[PDB]
Amino acid sequence: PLGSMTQTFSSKTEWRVRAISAANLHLRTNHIYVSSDDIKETGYTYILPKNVLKKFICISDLRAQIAGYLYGVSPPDNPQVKEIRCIVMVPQWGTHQTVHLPGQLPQHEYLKEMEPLGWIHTQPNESPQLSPQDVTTHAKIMADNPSWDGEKTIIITCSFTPGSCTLTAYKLTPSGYEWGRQNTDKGNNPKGYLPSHYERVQMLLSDRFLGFFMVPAQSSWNYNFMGVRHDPNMKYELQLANPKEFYHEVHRPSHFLNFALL
Amino acid sequence: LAPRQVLDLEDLVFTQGSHFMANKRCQLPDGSFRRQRKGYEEVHVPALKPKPFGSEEQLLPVEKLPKYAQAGFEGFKTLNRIQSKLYRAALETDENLLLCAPTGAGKTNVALMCMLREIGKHINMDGTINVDDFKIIYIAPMRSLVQEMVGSFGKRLATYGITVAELTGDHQEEISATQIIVCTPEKWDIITRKGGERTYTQLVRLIILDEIHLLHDDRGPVLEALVARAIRNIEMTQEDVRLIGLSATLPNYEDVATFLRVDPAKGLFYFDNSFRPVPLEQTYVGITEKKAIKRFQIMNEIVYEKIMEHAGKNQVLVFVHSRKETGKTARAIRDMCLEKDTLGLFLREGSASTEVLRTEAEQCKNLELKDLLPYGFAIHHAGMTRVDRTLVEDLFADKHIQVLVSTATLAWGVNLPAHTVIIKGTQVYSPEKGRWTELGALDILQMLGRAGRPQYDTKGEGILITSHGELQYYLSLLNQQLPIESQMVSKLPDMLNAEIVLGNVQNAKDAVNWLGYAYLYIRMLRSPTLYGISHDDLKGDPLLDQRRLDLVHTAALMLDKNNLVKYDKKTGNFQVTELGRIASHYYITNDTVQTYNQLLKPTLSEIELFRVFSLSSEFKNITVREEEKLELQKLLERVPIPVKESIEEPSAKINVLLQAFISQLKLEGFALMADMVYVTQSAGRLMRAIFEIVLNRGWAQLTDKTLNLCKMIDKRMWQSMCPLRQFRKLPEEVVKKIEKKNFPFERLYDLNHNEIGELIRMPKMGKTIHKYVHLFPKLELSVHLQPITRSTLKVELTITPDFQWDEKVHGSSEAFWILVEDVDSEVILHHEYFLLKAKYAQDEHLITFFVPVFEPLPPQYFIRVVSDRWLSCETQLPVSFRHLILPEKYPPPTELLDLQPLPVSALRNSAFESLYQDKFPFFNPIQTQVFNTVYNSDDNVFVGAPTGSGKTICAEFAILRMLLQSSEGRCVYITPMEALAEQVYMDWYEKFQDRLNKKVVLLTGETSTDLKLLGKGNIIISTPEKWDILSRRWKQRKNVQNINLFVVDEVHLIGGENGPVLEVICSRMRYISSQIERPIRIVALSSSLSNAKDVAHWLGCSATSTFNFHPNVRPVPLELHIQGFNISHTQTRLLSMAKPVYHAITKHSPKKPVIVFVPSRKQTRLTAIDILTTCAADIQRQRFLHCTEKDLIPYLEKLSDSTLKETLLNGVGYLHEGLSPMERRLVEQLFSSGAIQVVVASRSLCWGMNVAAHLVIIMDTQYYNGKIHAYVDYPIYDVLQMVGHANRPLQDDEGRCVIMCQGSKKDFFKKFLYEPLPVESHLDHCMHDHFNAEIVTKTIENKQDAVDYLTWTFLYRRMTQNPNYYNLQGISHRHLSDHLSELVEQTLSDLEQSKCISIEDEMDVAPLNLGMIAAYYYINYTTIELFSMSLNAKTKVRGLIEIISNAAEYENIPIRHHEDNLLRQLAQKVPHKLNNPKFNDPHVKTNLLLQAHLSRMQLSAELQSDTEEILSKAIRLIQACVDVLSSNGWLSPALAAMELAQMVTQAMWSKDSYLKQLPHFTSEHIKRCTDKGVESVFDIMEMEDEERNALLQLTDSQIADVARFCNRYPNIELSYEVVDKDSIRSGGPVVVLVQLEREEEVTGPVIAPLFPQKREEGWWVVIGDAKSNSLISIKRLTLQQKAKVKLDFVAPATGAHNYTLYFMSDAYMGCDQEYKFSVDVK
């Protein structure tokens, strides 16, 4: 009836479409918005410098989440304000739902006189609620690291809203910290997850000061093409340098060596 | 020139290029016959008869040639007919030549004869030649041909010492030490396109254009560009260059001759095809079959039938058009033969050449060749190895190979003729055209020129096969009937831009002039209808003026639309751009750079970068063929860099082809492989152009991406590949899995040699990989941050190489890029090129640059040093600002009080008021404020005010107060520049000595001549070091502490180069004032200082006495404009300022005088002419001549410069170092008179120029340093001085000055010209020579004293206000001591190692003899240390001259190698030879300049002023060794040095006369008087007056000059006695008394006209016997009428010794007396 062998399949890798899409991320850095109305006034006010935030958007991907650790201090006379001074990129991989950081926290001389303020991460879709997995990730970090106090550390989400980027920031609750430790359900709606597990914090973008980045000494930060070489127990040290974009050549050496291989 | 049309250039283009056929018909020689066979038509042309001469034609034997040229014809008995008719025009005239002959006639030797005539013009007496004077360019069309010429010409001229080389310099020494450059037209085009202050084109005396009929090819316009550029540059410079054209015999050769400026009656030589070496029987086969595959085998049928007609009888050379068809056809017509059993004709005889053809096809190792070589056949192409190709031609030359299939490469680069030549098809794939096209005309003529061995064959047989429709073309080409036309209308925009970038074409009329030199223009005049010009139009325009301007107008618009040029349609002017320069310098078409300018953005992807490259117009003809889309789509699915565009687009194909080439993928499509070669061989310069664009724009991320892509294209590998494979000799099988073990490459540095073996699981590759890991280039970085202000940061970057050098992988150099990036790695704050030379591969390198900072101190900056060549070779240094201590903000200035102008009457002194009352009525506001503190006080005062604020008068206020207080008070005035001291001297000598009858002096630099003037003068003017010499002896000199007033001018120069000396002397005057009880008044003057309070406290001036004014209170207001300029290439940027210089004159001062400062002397005259032609094009000529026509010739025609006369006649002068002092004075007078409005002064003259202007223009702020061969920024102190000249108080309401700078230097000048200047100390880097002087004078006796001495310095005050600048990390008191003690510890440790000082018990220091000599004569401790090593007991004049030369004092004044040979040939002009001298040292440079001055050799203009600087330090160094030799007890060497003192003074030798020092003395008077034998100077003072015109009588005054010299010739009476000759013991008190007497009084100083400084008589009294070579006692004295000397020695035990008394001078020769003792020991 039908003559088969009619048409031949042609491989169309999906990472190419995202690589082309990642090259236009710089346009979103001119229109970055912060969730405003809040409930307000109270906690610490976290001030994020624009230069590292724009760089954090440029090195990311539209669907695979990336994360960086927050470090900073307070102004000399104003303890209720937290200026974010450094973002640390560590070996990581992620999905559309979460990221996978190692167990070890950043440890370096430059950061020892700064206090950790939490972590910032991207996500594809703007959401009204903090991710239940973000609550689990933040709580499991607090359980293993007493330097992360629940009243001092936050979770900044950089949502990809069409032609823009929206920043909302949350902190954990004692109820949220307690449930996040026990949670072994990665599903998008586990049992026990409630809106009572977090609150919003006030966040301000500033041009008055500049932050800086810290990246792995050897290595790099993006392991989304080398997930085998990523392990939760992996160790790493840092250097004072700016990070490479997501699809930089050093993050996907197999694409360059397997193409050259005959 | 206004009503014109815009043309369509592409409609004027000959599309077929070289295949264009201008002749409508073709006439064939007698005996031709066309034959119609089935499928194809044959055309036969019989061989031509070399019709037997006629008139005189003797073959010229090389014995008759000029003798110097016979060595180039060694191995040749007699020239052929072509060379013999050309040899006199070639060897005996400089006429431009054009020689057309069939290929093989011997045109190469005719060019060799012109090359020999050029070589003969520079043959020196030595036998060798002068490599400097000349350079020869041989332009060959093919790269393969260029290489053969390098060997041939190199061997023929090897006996001359001539070097011939091809491209070795594009990749950068390139061209120098290379007298004959062989190159392609394109290569010479790009080399001469980036014309800097070069060392190439000006040395070019001869250009040979071989195969100049290339003009008809698409590459032809390159030859038109070369000739036009050379010929037009001839008339601009009026320096001749000889052009030689060698062409085939084709029509329009007379137009070619007009194009080369060849006189047709002298240099035109045309020889038809009858002059072929062997006659040629031509056969042309034209196929009518149009279907592809039947025509394919028809072609394969005609080749076989033709091969069979020569099998066995003749070798046959078959040409095809690929590296693949060479073996494919050679097999296609081998097997066809076996099919018919038709090889008994080739081989098949058991011949003596059958086994050799076999037996060499086993040591063959070529698979395809060994398949074919045994059975007669063979192939040859570039893909085969060198010995493989040399194999096939060694057999073919010995007549062993019968069938050889090759391509065009063999025809060009090898001399391999065959009896029969077959051209199988004339179609070749062109990737540039993107299609198949016909063969070029040059390839056809070269291949068929190989037919017929010029010795064997009575005839050659050339067979050409092609399509029937191209028969008429190839008959036209090979039978002298294909005319040569110009293909230049296509390339016109790109070539016009190349002349705009060079500066040769600055407007439309320059372009019309330039176009008139093009071969297109000559062809347009002769055959206008071929070039779209009606004869109706040609006479409405006889010389095609309107037509050329239309072409230029059309071309200029295209350049303007693409942003290469700014075209001003009204004036027709052209403005150069950076984009236009990059297009010219990188050989990029103008459409491509427009695409780059449109799409390049700093946020660019690697995806878009590859896409932008694929859109370059060089690939405009590339298309995606349907038969290629499958292989292309298979790659698009796997490429590492994604491609957005569809495979339908040709840009996607170009993109994939580039990615495949980097990954080293081999493709299948024949077009794809050739298309890949074309895109990638263009990717080099294309991507290198993109790199220079984004680098000079500061785009950090894109610069890193483009520079990497450049290296990935060159190395053919991605970053992910392990960088070890960049070593080609390293096995490609170990790297295999070193990549696959996923671990960083930086880990192998920290491992041994057998750990790498187990980590990779290959212990056999132990040390081999460890070897290359540490051969990979690697640099370690360190910084010392030095804050200047709170907004400007100075950085000293130390680069330490951390890799072992190897020439076989690194070469002679290794280049890097230094990049300074901001916080976000987004903006390049600063960048520069860094070159690690092999000779310094193990030394640390220091780099300094400025960087802006702002005050919420950024987290950090980054300093990357990436390689220019190596992939994955980079070191980034984070520059943290966490612990950076910024200096404090400078305090507000002292307000300028609104006081009423103070009249000159306030001095209240008639004689004092008499010095100013004429010049001006009232003092300026700045002189008014300080008046009471200076004139009515003794407090130390600091006056800081801008240049031109009248600070010279306030210093005079303190001088006049000193004259009131004491009658014989002494003032010492210090100014940092000698040029300033000479002008201050001229002013103050007239005001204080002429009018008020005091004594004003100017220090010489001669110690003893100076010392008198301090006791003689009331105002001593001196430079810092000329007062350091004097004040060092202040505890022994009373004329140093008696000083009432010490005034130091321009004290802000303590931060400059020679600042540390200015810091020591004033610090000494403050310490001297401490020891005596009467303070010495100190007045400090400076330009506006930000840290003025530091200088005041350091100089002990109270707050109310410190006047810190800022630039805003300058008396005459200063309007400062700072124009930025984008171009990073200096010569192009200087061009971009030419018209802005003129436009700034008309805008800011069209009426009042203007000074223009330019970087170099050559630029002075260039811009002076540039201003004039712009004024003439403004039809405002002679606007700058406010004087007249004739009142000026009483000033003109007094100069040697011809251009200086023309410039002044139009109102513009210029000043530079090369003009004689009389010319500079006269140009200044015309400028100050208002006669001339503009003067162009060099940067070197900004300190010694006594003229001012209303407007000053600083054209650029850099200058080239000849030593380090790099551009250096103007010191900020020189810029302040230049701006100071824009100030005329009683002439102009304001002052204006425009500073044209590079864009990067703009904000720097804004921060340090509008704000006051911060100054620092650098005494910590110049501590040794001063510490040694204090050890000698016992001011420092221990290490605690050294710390105490430093507390008196400006350095001590600054290292607590700005600690990081001096590498302090805290202003603690202990951080100060540890810093001061460490400086003290090393400085004294260096001195004692040099044996200058002695240290006892880690604490006490005491001077040694070496240190006492270095301090006494002001010599570097490093110099006097090397003197003791070199000098010994047997040194005379030739060793003294040797080691005095290589001293640290002479080192840093440049070495120019436009004189590498004069000094090589002056070494061949000296009495004393050198041992293995190499003429690369600024020290051996002086050694021969010293020998030249003693030889009285006039060398060059300002080489002489260079030896004036060598002579100013020679006497002090000679006396130093005199001290060294005598201290060691050596007699013979000391007296030889004591006579070179008088040798270097009178410029004579010991071999020479004594009467050589009398004035006006003729040359040969040394033998003159030998007939009488009277050579004494003695004589010539005592003869009788009517003949005491002894021998010679010269004028009424030239004897009165001999009279004054004889009257001040030293006539000294010597009385000597040994006190108590009868009471001497064996080692007791001994005393000898010598008494001197001047039979005279004294008539001023020594008479030495050949010596700059005026010296005074020095004398040595010497004792010691010459038998033992022992000096026992020596003393120095100055005579002056009568004096006695005493020598105390020690008796040498017992005996009867007899010593010898020497009395020697240091100035005159011929007075060294000699008496011998009368002793008696007991």
Ligand SMILES: CNc1ccccc1C(=O)O[C@H]1[C@@H](O)[C@H](n2cnc3c(N)ncnc32)O[C@@H]1COP(=O)(O)OP(=O)(O)OP(=O)(O)S
């Ligand atoms: C040698 N002569 C000249 C030759 C060519 C062109 C100009 C002059 C010239 O004469 O002009 C000088 C000065 O003679 C004069 N001047 C001073 N006081 C003045 C007053 N109260 N009214 C009016 N004019 C006054 O104004 C210029 C400031 O020159 P200076 O004194 O050198 O200013 P500086 O601060 O730069 O001193 P300095 O240590 O750099 S040399």
Ligand SMILES: [Mg+2]
């Ligand atoms: Mg030739």
Ligand SMILES: [Mg+2]
């Ligand atoms: Mg001054």
